[PDB]
């Protein structure tokens, strides 16, 4: 039904610019105010900006005024955030959110997207090396076997892992990343599957590290 | 700058009515909204305009607001309700939406659950790249605290270890990961390695061998 | 025809 | 002659009863042509004159959205004003807004208006230059500064000089058979003795449009602006208006008094005599 | 907060003729706030079917409204308008008079 899909997040050097976009579907986009709200790592929510239904009124948090610009294209059902002169403290998950009325003022946010990450950093991106984690004998006595993918040495977070191009969801557990002493991250994603169905269905993890445009698909065999 | 104050933590027993407060100067003259953000999820609107509930939100979520204090009330609280809750108001004088700092709602007393541990050896591919990583995956434990010990043929290994602080999973249980880095040589010179996970005085050991 | 612009006080 | 289009909005807060009452009416001159009422059963902007029904579904959808958006703005503003003024939550409060434009006999823009009241008293108004604001008090000064910072006057001016005028002109054409026509007052005199020495003469004007009218009593051809009872012009209920003026005269001297009726529907002013 | 009491005028749409259908009007104007109770009366009794115009207001922001109902007047039936508003201590009654 209703979706707010954010994109454009990634790693930006401080002082540079980035444009976030949010694709709205499943509702009459031009009947509603729209907003950007962010959340820095480990911290609470902070409203960034809002725009009423027809762009007739627009607002910004003081923290971003003069640097960020909110806009909307009601023909394309899209909302945008142009972020200029980025600073380390702009690092956050940016959520696209629907205002529960026509106006950006007063009416709370009733639908939130899953967010897109903005990492304002002086460092470089590093795509991960992906290795299969093969299933092995008696992996879980209850007729199920575990197999996964090791997503190794990337920066920054996040990385998304899917299996069988999103077809296989049940039994999937992508673990929170470990931050190594090296300053790089690693994570693993495991799918537990019935032990009967091995060498019947193919198992492929689809790793996407958007910050470095790194997309790796890895077949995971009982080899 | 207009300020909303929430206690950082509220702890509760299942079946009680939890109460999360949101203080603000003359907050009574404002229209309060409350959001629920569970682990790994975007926020969800649970109450708007002090006391109203969006369609789909259980009746047990309610709100009040008068004077210098707004309250979110959750009756018949259950484990699923564990989340960060944020109050919010539009402030016209400052032209800002304001959020409280968030309250972490813990539901105490959930059943003890020992961890499932999965230990993977290094892939052929990784060894082929002259590197080796053992991956120890720990899930479905409660409460969220474990000791992870690596051993090489029973001998404790401390170097090349990286363990995550446990984090609450979707099901209100916790997960953690530990990774052991080795040279292919180190890996092959041992009959086996083990990942020993202690949880609430009980240890689960898993082993792998070249 | 009415005015489509909304402004808060 | 000249014409005007005006929109009138009233929002009343209703503590405990829940949502505020919102009613909007639109007029061309003295003819109402639409309404939006939160307490009506419809939930849409609706027609109040036959000529506005010429408009298609897109007009109705658009004007309905505008009414729903405006309603939400006033509801927000009622909360905002309670806050600015530090008023308690238990009492009821009111916002009124009137806006519109005037055009000349050949459709030329004459002027525009935008004025807002709180609890029946001026709050903020767009000035005639349509480039600045007058704030009635210190709370309205909060509003004025924020509106100046966002160049709100330019947005209103664009409306008043643009679609407001375009809308008015189109309504004047579509509804020309009523809006650009007049109904002359139907007149008569009544006589009612008060005592043996005085009697009341009442001069009536009925069924007229537009509302503007002048009723005057003279005595021996001299204006009698002293002993004249004069009621407010009032709606007949069918889109026309009524008014009367009366004078207390000495019994027997009735023929000395004349009632003079001026209305644009008349080719010449009328003189009535008992 | 300044409140204004209503002016009341009771009249018929057309000059009254016995046995001829017509409309009975009560116009209330000059009041604030807008909450107001208005009843049309036939021989002191409340008339059920009564409608009113859409709330609007004047240049001084005072409200006006027309309440009305179709009626066929007779020589023996008396009519009136009963009005209550926060500015009034009890309902003010204005009787319909053909001559006003």
- Selecting from A45, A50, A181 the residue whose C-beta is nearest the C-beta of B43 gives A45
Domain identity same for B91 and B146 = no
Asked if E touches B (at least 3 Cβ pairs < 8 angstroms), the answer reads no
Domain of residue B2: give its range.
Answer: 1-109
Rounded Cα–Cα distance for residues A131 and A116 (Å): 26
Domain identity same for B130 and B64 = no
CA angle in degrees (0–180, nearest 5) for D109-D110-D111: 100
Closest by CA position to A109, among listed C6, B43, B1: B43
Tell me how the structure was determined. X-ray
Domain identity same for B94 and B4 = yes
Burial class (CB in 10 A: 0-12, 13-18, 19+), B136: buried
Joined tokens for residue D24: 């909007």
Joined tokens for residue A156: 């920054």
Domain of residue D191: give its range.
Answer: 182-274
Residues linked to residue B162 through DSSP beta bridges, in sequence order:
B179
Closest by CA position to A222, among listed A131, A132, A129: A132
Q: What is the fold, at CATH topology level, of the domain defined by E1-100? A: Immunoglobulin-like (2.60.40)
Closest by CA position to A47, among listed A55, A29, A35, A34: A35
Say whether D89 and B28 touch across the interface (CB within 8 A). yes
Joined tokens for residue B70: 């707004």
Asked if D touches E (at least 3 Cβ pairs < 8 angstroms), the answer reads yes
Is D84 known to sit in a ligand binding site?
Answer: yes
Is D257 known to sit in a ligand binding site?
Answer: no
Per-residue H/E/C for chain E: CCCECCEEEEEECCCCCCCCCEEEEEEEEEEECCCCEEEEEECCEECCCCEECCCEECCCCCEEEEEEEEECCCCCCCEEEEEECCCCCCCEEEECCCCC
Joined tokens for residue A32: 């509603």
Resolution in A: 2.2
User: Domains in chain A and their CATH numbers?
Assistant: 1-122 (2.60.40.10), 123-223 (2.60.40.10)
* Radius of gyration from C-alpha coordinates of chain B: 24
The count of CB pairs under 8 A between chains C and D is: 54
Contact status of A107 with chain C (Cβ, < 8 Å): no
Mutation site, C1, C2, C3, C8, interface A, largest A CB count within 10 A: C8
Domain identity same for D37 and D82 = yes
Rounded Cα–Cα distance for residues A11 and E6 (Å): 67
Torsion of CA A210, A216, A217, A221, to 10 degrees: -130
Say whether C4 and A54 touch across the interface (CB within 8 A). yes
Rounded Cα–Cα distance for residues D109 and D102 (Å): 6
- What residues in D contact E14, CB-CB < 8 Å? 206, 236
Domain identity same for D34 and D137 = yes
DSSP letter, residue A126: B
By the 8 A CB rule, do D75 and D22 touch? yes
- What residues in C contact A105, CB-CB < 8 Å? 8
- Selecting from D62, D73, D167 the residue whose C-beta is nearest the C-beta of C8 gives D73
We report the CATH number of the domain holding residue B146 as 2.60.40.10
Q: Please state whether beta strands E51-52 and E45-46 pair in parallel, antiparallel, or not at all (unpaired).
A: unpaired
Q: What are phi and psi of B67, to 5 degrees?
A: 60, -125
Joined tokens for residue A80: 């945008």
CA angle in degrees (0–180, nearest 5) for A213-A216-A219: 170
- What residues in B contact C7, CB-CB < 8 Å? none
By the 8 A CB rule, do B204 and B197 touch? yes
Rounded Cα–Cα distance for residues E7 and E92 (Å): 10
What's the gap in Å between the CA of D141 and the closest CA on chain B?
A: 11
By the 8 A CB rule, do D20 and D12 touch? yes
Domain identity same for B7 and B93 = yes
Domain identity same for D62 and D165 = yes
- Selecting from D27, D117, D231 the residue whose C-beta is nearest the C-beta of E61 gives D117
- What residues in D contact B29, CB-CB < 8 Å? 79, 82-83, 86-87, 89
Run of H or E including D149: helix D138-149
- In 3-state terms, what secondary structure has residue A5? strand
Q: How many domains does chain D have?
A: 2
Q: What share of chain C is helix, strand, coil (3-state, %, to 5)?
A: 0, 0, 100
Rounded Cα–Cα distance for residues A130 and A147 (Å): 14
Burial profile D9-46: b = 16 or more Cβ within 10 angstroms, e = fewer = bbbbbeeeeeebbbbbbbbbbbbbbbbbbbeeeeebbb
By the 8 A CB rule, do D263 and D205 touch? yes
Is D73 known to sit in a ligand binding site?
Answer: yes
Domain boundary (D146, D161, D181) is at D181
């Amino acid at each position: 039904e209703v979706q707010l899909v954010e994109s454009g997040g990634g790693l930006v050097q401080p002082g540079r610019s980035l444009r976030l976009s949010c694709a709205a579907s499943g509702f009459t986009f031009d009947d509603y105010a729209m907003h950007w709200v962010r959340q820095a790592p480990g911290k609470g929510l902070e409203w960034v900006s809002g725009i009423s239904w027809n762009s007739g009124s627009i607002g910004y948090a003081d923290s971003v005024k003069g640097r960020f610009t909110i806009s909307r294209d009601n023909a394309k059902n899209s909302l945008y955030l142009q972020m200029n002169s980025l600073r380390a403290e702009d690092t956050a998950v940016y959520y696209c959110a629907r205002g529960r009325g026509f106006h950006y003022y007063y009416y709370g946010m009733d639908i939130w997207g899953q967010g897109t990450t903005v990492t304002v950093s002086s460092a470089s991106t590093k795509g991960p090396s992906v290795f299969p984690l093969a299933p092995s004998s008696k992996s879980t006595s209850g007729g199920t076997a575990a197999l996964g993918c090791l997503v190794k040495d990337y920066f920054p977070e996040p990385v998304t892992v899917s299996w069988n191009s999103g077809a296989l969801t049940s039994g999937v557990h992508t673990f929170p990343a470990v931050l190594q002493s090296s300053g790089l991250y690693s994570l693993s994603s495991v799918v537990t599957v019935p032990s009967s169905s091995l060498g019947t269905q193919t198992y492929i993890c689809n790793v996407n590290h958007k910050p470095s445009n790194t997309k790796v698909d890895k077949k995971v065999e009982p080899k | 700058s207009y300020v909303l104050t929430q206690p950082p933590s509220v702890s509760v027993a299942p079946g009680q009515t939890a109460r999360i407060t949101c203080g603000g100067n003359n907050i009574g003259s404002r229209s309060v909204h409350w959001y629920q953000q569970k682990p790994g999820q975007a926020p969800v609107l649970v109450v708007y305009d002090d006391s109203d509930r969006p369609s789909g939100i259980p009746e047990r979520f309610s709100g009040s607001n008068s004077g210098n204090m707004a309250t979110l009330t959750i009756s018949r609280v259950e484990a699923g309700d564990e989340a960060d809750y944020y109050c919010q108001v539009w402030d016209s004088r400052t032209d800002h939406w304001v959020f409280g700092g968030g309250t972490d709602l813990t539901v105490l007393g959930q059943p003890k659950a020992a961890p499932s541990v999965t230990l993977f050896p290094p892939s052929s591919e990784e060894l082929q790249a002259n590197k080796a990583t053992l991956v120890c995956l720990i899930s479905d434990f409660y409460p969220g605290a474990v000791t992870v010990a690596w051993k090489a043929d029973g001998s404790p290994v401390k170097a090349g270890v990286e363990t995550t602080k446990p984090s609450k999973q979707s099901n209100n249980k916790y997960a953690a990961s530990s990774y052991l880095s080795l040279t292919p040589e180190q890996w092959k010179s041992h009959r086996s390695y083990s990942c020993q996970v202690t949880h609430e005085g009980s240890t689960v050991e898993k082993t792998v061998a070249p | 025809e009415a005015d489509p612009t909304g402004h808060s006080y | 002659g000249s014409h005007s289009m005006r929109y009138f909005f009233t929002s009343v807060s209703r503590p405990g009863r829940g949502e505020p009452r919102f009613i909007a009416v639109g007029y061309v001159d003295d003819t109402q042509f639409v309404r939006f009422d939160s307490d009506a059963a419809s939930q849409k902007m609706e027609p109040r004159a036959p000529w506005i029904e010429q408009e298609g579904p897109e007009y109705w959808d658009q004007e309905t959205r505008n009414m729903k958006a405006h309603s939400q703005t006033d509801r927000a503003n009622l909360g905002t004003l309670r806050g600015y003024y530090n008023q308690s939550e238990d009492g009821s409060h009111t916002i009124q807004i009137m806006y519109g434009c005037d055009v000349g006999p050949d459709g030329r823009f004459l002027r525009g208006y935008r004025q807002d009241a709180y609890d029946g008293k001026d709050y903020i108004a767009l000035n005639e230059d349509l480039r600045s604001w007058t704030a009635a008090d210190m709370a309205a000064q909060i509003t004025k500064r924020k509106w100046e910072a966002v160049h709100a006057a330019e947005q209103r001016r664009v409306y008043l000089e643009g679609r407001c005028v375009d809308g008015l002109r189109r309504y004047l054409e579509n509804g020309k058979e009523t809006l650009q026509r007049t109904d002359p007052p139907k007149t008569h005199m009544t006589h009612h003795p008060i005592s043996d020495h005085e009697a009341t003469l009442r001069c009536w004007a009925l069924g007229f449009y537009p509302a503007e009218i002048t009723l005057t009593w003279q005595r021996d051809g001299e204006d009698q602006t002293q002993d004249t009872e004069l009621v407010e012009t009032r709606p007949a209920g069918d889109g026309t208006f009524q008014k009367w003026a009366a004078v207390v005269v000495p019994s027997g001297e009735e023929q000395r008094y004349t009632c003079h009726v001026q209305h644009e529907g008349l080719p010449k002013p009328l003189t009535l005599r008992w | 907060m300044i409140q204004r009491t209503p002016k009341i005028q009771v009249y018929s749409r057309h000059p009254a003729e016995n046995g001829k259908s017509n409309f009975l009007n009560c116009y209330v104007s000059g009041f604030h706030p807008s909450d107001i109770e208005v009843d049309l009366l036939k021989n002191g009794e409340r008339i059920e079917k009564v409608e009113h115009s859409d709330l609007s207001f004047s240049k001084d922001w005072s409200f006006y409204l027309l309440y009305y109902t179709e009626f066929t007047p007779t020589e023996k039936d008396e009519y009136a308008c009963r009005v209550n508003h926060v500015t009034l201590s009890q309902p003010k009654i204005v009787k319909w008079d053909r001559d006003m």
